[PDB]
Design a protein around this nucleic acid. Structure first.
Lengths: 76, 88, 74, 90, 74, 76, 88, 90
DNA sequence: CAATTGGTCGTAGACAGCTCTAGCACCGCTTAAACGCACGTACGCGCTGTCCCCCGCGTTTTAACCGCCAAGGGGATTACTCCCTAGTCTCCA
DNA sequence: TGGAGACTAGGGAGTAATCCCCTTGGCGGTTAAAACGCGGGGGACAGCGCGTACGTGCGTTTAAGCGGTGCTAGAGCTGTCTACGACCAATTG
């Protein structure tokens, strides 16, 4: 489920983002933003895997899916 | 270049409604842009797999990549039901 | 990383199931997705904190994420 | 002719000729330009279907660029394709 | 258009002078730049008005343009 | 000068943007945003003209410069 | 692919400072990315002018387009003062 | 050898071989890969010059990916090139 | 076992020559649009106060992580070997 | 007056057949991390007030726009014509 993105993991992401205090409704909105981001990147990674006639989503399919959003990822 | 076929599809979709002369240049730049975008995406997909031939499968993948959602599902369905009608 | 790895792998394997059933993921594809998702969420909360300071507040609210995503074009 | 034979409206041979003059690869396929002409034909017959629906919904006779700008930025069906486009209107 | 054409042509011909001296512009290049600049400024003031409503205000202020450009990545 | 972008032209752009009331300091900030936007697009249009060995910046050089910013322009 | 030359330039710029094994893959993906970006920009510039040969002038223009500002001025100056030293 | 002859550190022949296997055009130029190898050489000798400056400024011995992530997002000289990049750090 | 250097061989791009759009320039007259007031009132901005509701500290509960060892699906490869795409003669508007 | 139908001669991909990584799946014992609950108090959020500062309406000033001449630069050709990059035979590490 999306519930695995727990309350203190979003709190740690906001503490690294520089947020001092978090409202009690950020937690379900951040999961809804993360789910949209994954539904936009995994769709392209699955498209590259189905185009490569594979069944295993490699890390270069994820790098290409992030490259198609202007989010180039170095190290794979 | 592609302006002679935009009016030919418009005669099928709306045989009564006409089109202007600036709107024909807009639809012609739209067609030359979505053409040079789909073909560019299919050339990058032919390079990522180290192929040399752009088949219809790299076009179907570049349509899945470029067009979001329902527009990609209908463009793939129209390209598939045009290639199958072509081979028969 | 800041999100736990096994619930993030369950999340990717339950999101990707809607696209193609019975897929396998490399062990580094999930870490590339988790690295990219925290690098997305921190960069999102850096503009949410700007939208919360802009209203003369400290607590971020869901309207700050909604403004930081509508201005960004999401 | 393969366009009438495929019962399409765009010419396959001109899209193939533009793929040759674009040099997008070294060699095309047999049915790749038929698929590409059917997708571009679908997108044109989906945009101009709405421009012709809006010209008669508003009451206009021709299709002006103001109709294109109002449709493609409305109609969330294809407003996503034109998030970053600007019709010039001049 | 909303900006007057001759001062916008003077602006383009005084900005481009820093890049290559003694340039000429087509009459439609300046109208493409003016169409793109008003289509930029309206899309900028649509997010500035969102940043001004977000602070419970009506008047837009320069900090609203600065927030709408820092979130956008400018 | 940049002063040709007058006060009521910025006011008309804000009225089309949906702004009801404008502070008295928006006028010099908007000129500073417009000048940055033109310094970013005209640099690429002049680069395409110097690459094409021309001296006249055509409208397709402007379309290519706007395409290099994710601002595709139809109609030229 | 390009990892053998990153360490060779690093021996010139810092002969005392070493590099890790993940940072070599990061610099190798950086080099293969700015290569496949400059060459892609120079192929679009060879298509916009209807040429067929990528010369050094389409590389100088793709460097002016891709790199912003002072990085473009120094990359053009280094490419020019490497082609001139090459022809001599 | 043209790399030592041009007094460069990257191999011109491998960048040319990667332009041939990328099929970016039909025919290259005589001096286009020398220019491209000198620009990529400049960018590598500008990023690793700063990674080697920061490893000795901090006091580190090797170069870790944390040094690359701290430099390329600092250093407004080349922070514009990496506005939309993410070093993975894993 | 690289990458290079002499020859050679088309052919693409350099390049004088020339037609003619079209961009730049100036003059004069409108008339809209900008510009400068002065006034009244919205509405930013500071303040004070009641009151959620978030943070911090304890327990206690969960499940992530680690270290094993299977087991089979499936990259990645090497080998042929057909079946395709690239070169060429006519119809039917 | 433009395609595109039968035939060639090859040469990327299809398609088996083969290792052998490596992904998925258990178990079991950790101990960190999440979850709950209590309480105190920071700080959204509402309400009020003083008072800048923006908008609207006026008269006056500017200039943009328009129409009409010129006039030369310089895009687009068209036709040569070299120098160029694509191919092939002996090497300092």
């Amino acid at each position: 489920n999306i519930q695995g993105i727990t309350k203190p993991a979003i709190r740690r992401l906001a503490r690294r983002g520089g947020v001092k205090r978090i409202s009690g409704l950020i937690y379900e909105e951040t999961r809804g933003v993360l789910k949209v981001f994954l539904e936009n990147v995994i769709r392209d990674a699955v498209t590259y895997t189905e185009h490569a006639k594979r069944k295993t989503v490699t890390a270069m399919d994820v790098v290409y899916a992030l490259k198609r959003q202007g989010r180039t990822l170095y190290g794979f | 270049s592609y302006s002679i076929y935009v009016y030919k599809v418009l005669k099928q979709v709306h045989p009564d409604t006409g089109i202007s002369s600036k709107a024909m240049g807009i639809m012609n730049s739209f067609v030359n842009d979505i053409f040079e975008r789909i073909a560019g995406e299919a050339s990058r997909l032919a390079h990522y797999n180290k192929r040399s031939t752009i088949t219809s499968r790299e076009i179907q993948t570049a349509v899945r990549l470029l067009l979001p959602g329902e527009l990609a599902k209908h463009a793939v369905s129209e390209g598939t039901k045009a290639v199958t009608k072509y081979t028969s | 990383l800041l999100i736990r790895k096994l619930p993030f792998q369950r999340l990717v394997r339950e999101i990707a199931q809607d696209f193609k059933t019975d897929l396998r993921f490399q062990s580094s594809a999930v870490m590339a997705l988790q690295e990219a998702c925290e690098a997305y969420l921190v960069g999102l909360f850096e503009d949410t904190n700007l939208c919360a300071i802009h209203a003369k507040r400290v607590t971020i609210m869901p309207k700050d994420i909604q403004l930081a995503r509508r201005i960004r074009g999401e | 002719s393969r366009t009438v034979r495929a019962e399409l409206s765009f010419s396959v041979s001109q899209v193939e000729r533009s793929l040759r003059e674009g040099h997008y690869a070294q060699r095309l396929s047999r049915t790749a330009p038929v698929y590409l002409a059917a997708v571009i034909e679908y997108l044109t017959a989906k945009v101009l279907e709405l421009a012709g629906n809006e010209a008669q919904n508003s009451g206009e006779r021709n299709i002006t660029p103001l109709l294109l700008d109002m449709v493609v930025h409305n109609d969330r069906l294809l407003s996503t394709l034109f998030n970053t486009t600007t019709i010039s209107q001049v």
